[PDB]
């Protein structure tokens, strides 16, 4: 028997999480991999997890009940993850498939039926964490909000927030596609060269530059992608053009203070504005089966490039959760939870 | 025998609200012959109707700030829509007696040089001319435009229309139940809310004296919001949107007269997947401007469409009309009325 570690929501944070106190992990529970009464299921055994932004919002008390529902407290978080079927008395599931979907943060889970999880088309041998980001979750909502709400014409200029992470180095990619200038700010140095990279025309430092200033000098700006709200969407509507569209996706400024205002909402009115927010699992059904059959033979052929940050061992998974929420992610979170007998095997 | 043409002449930028005579002044000193006055080839026109409309204080600013639009200019008459009546006539193609609308100085008298600026009037139905600034004016377009531009409504959602007894707000309470919408309108005083109910409003509330979240928790959540006032309304709104709510952003008024007003849960917009559109009556109107012509004034006649307006009579008040709307003590679309029409005017004892 071998152990089957947890991250369990343990208390609800009043600023950002703090680990070890708002998770826990918990190496209490064991598993025999031969002897686990399957009841016709599988055997799954979890190797990638995402750390993703919004798991911040999860982490509140339980409330009536919405389309968005909180974590529970005492219980395993969960999220999008990458798993293998060790063992499976199910005839869907064969040992060896690996399975896309939300995973509880353990490692090992005992599946009755494929609810929940999809087959991984994996043709181009890319590394499974792959599936978590430029062709998972993060990678659909660039893809799919930008086609959805950009209307771009050639010439017009976008400024895209959090630029290096991996919804907005997507969104970048594809702006550039469609002939756009490129303005995008992010955290560190080694950011701003990955935003140059996947080529943005002017690509800044926020903690070291100012930000309305630039906006004024490269802008104005057409279309703003929104991923930290605050101070940040005010300096955008302050710089916007006449018709601009503004993608709202995320609003990170003020996940770990409960909002961030803005002062100067006036300006859609003035500067007739379209402000949409999305939720990607709301528009996905439109776009999943062209996204799933042009998305993997560009990542294979570099056309469109990723950056991750692998941290090793689900017992890190409550310190990158904060990792995301301060920023110190050098790119896409993901947690490295066990390696796959294929590729990478273990020998001295 | 020359009348005084008298103006209202923008003096000061106000700080707060505006204030009558220190921010706007009432200037008598010019006088006009109107049978002397020399026209070179153009026309004498008459002010008979001016609007007072809640964006006038948005122009009461320095001529820096220069924004959207263009900032009232001082020492200079303001200006806003209007409609007068030709007197005399040097150019061929208006002709005394024509009634005209659109932008006029805040004077009784000007003398154009032809008809930029101004379009004949078509009053086939004979209504007030003061109709032409308000439910058939740029007020209507406002409210008949942006709901068929933006509202995209879905028989038997729900909208909620804050400013709801005004005349954007009780236009579009009226195109939103043609559409087969359930209607939640507030307004700030009893007699309001008799208006919006008589306009088929749903649920009518006194937001001074009822709380705005209360009613929404109670008769939402909101498909629609037609955002008149912004601030702590629109806040409310958020709170209470349905998942793909549409937001028209028309006014924010809670926030003109002290430097913008603030929102703190705009987050609302990713979580329920709210399309917020803000908009300018201007840039949308040659889309629909015919439509508007053709379809509006028929239904004004036969009381399809019906409205209220605050008559204000005397050029003098103007100033103090601004400052009424930007209070609320308006009770309907502000209306200053300048002068009577001389049309059916027989001089007998
Ligand atoms: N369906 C949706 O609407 C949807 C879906 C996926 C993601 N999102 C949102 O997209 C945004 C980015 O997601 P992602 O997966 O690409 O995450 P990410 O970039 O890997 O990580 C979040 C990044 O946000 C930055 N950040 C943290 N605090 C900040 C602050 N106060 N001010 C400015 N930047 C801050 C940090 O990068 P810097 O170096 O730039 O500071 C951090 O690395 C998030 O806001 C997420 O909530 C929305
Ligand atoms: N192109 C455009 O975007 C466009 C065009 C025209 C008009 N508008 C806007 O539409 C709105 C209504 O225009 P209207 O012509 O129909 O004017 P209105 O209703 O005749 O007059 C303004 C009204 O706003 C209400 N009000 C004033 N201060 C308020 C405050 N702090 N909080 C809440 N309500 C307040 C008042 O009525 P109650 O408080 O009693 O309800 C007041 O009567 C304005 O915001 C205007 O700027 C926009
Ligand atoms: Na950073």
Redesign the interface.
């Known amino acids: 028997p071998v152990t089957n570690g947890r991250i369990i929501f343990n208390s609800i944070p009043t600023g950002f999480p703090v680990p070890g106190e708002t998770t826990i992990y918990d190496t209490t529970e064991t598993i025999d991999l031969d002897t686990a009464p399957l009841d016709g299921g599988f055997l799954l055994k979890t190797l990638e997890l995402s750390v993703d932004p919004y798991m911040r919002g999860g982490m509140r008390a339980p409330e009536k009940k919405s389309?968005?529902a909180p974590f529970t407290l005492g219980q395993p978080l969960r999220g999008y993850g990458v798993g293998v079927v060790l063992r499976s008395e199910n005839p869907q599931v064969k040992a060896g498939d690996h399975l896309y979907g939300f995973f509880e943060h353990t490692h090992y889970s005992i599946r009755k039926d494929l609810t929940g999880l999809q087959a991984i088309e994996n043709a181009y041998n890319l590394p499974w964490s792959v599936f978590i980001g430029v062709i998972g979750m993060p990678g659909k909502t660039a893809y799919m909000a930008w086609k959805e709400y950009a209307h771009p014409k050639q010439g017009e200029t976008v400024f895209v927030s959090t630029g290096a992470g991996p919804v907005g180095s997507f969104v970048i990619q594809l702006a550039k596609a469609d002939g756009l200038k490129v303005i995008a700010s992010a955290g560190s140095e080694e950011k701003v060269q990955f935003m140059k990279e996947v080529g943005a025309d002017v690509a800044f430092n926020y903690k070291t530059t100012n930000t309305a200033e630039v906006l004024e000098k490269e802008g104005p700006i057409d279309i703003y992608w929104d991923n930290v709200?605050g101070e940040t969407?005010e300096a955008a509507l302050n710089a916007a053009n006449?018709n601009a569209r503004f993608i709202?996706?995320?609003?990170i400024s003020?996940y770990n203070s409960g909002?961030?205002?803005?002062?100067?909402?006036?300006?859609?009115?003035?500067?007739?504005?379209?402000?949409?927010?999305?939720?990607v699992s709301?528009i996905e059904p439109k776009y999943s089966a062209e996204f799933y059959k042009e998305v993997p033979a560009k990542v294979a052929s570099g056309e469109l490039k990723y950056r991750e940050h692998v941290y090793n061992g689900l017992e890190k998974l409550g310190d990158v959760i904060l990792a995301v929420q301060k920023g110190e992610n050098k790119a896409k979170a993901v947690v490295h939870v066990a390696d796959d007998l294929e590729h990478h095997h273990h020998h001295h």
């Open positions: 389309y968005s709200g969407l006449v709202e996706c995320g609003m003020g909002g961030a205002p803005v002062r100067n909402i006036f300006h859609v009115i003035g500067k007739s504005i379209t402000m949409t927010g999305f939720i709301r």
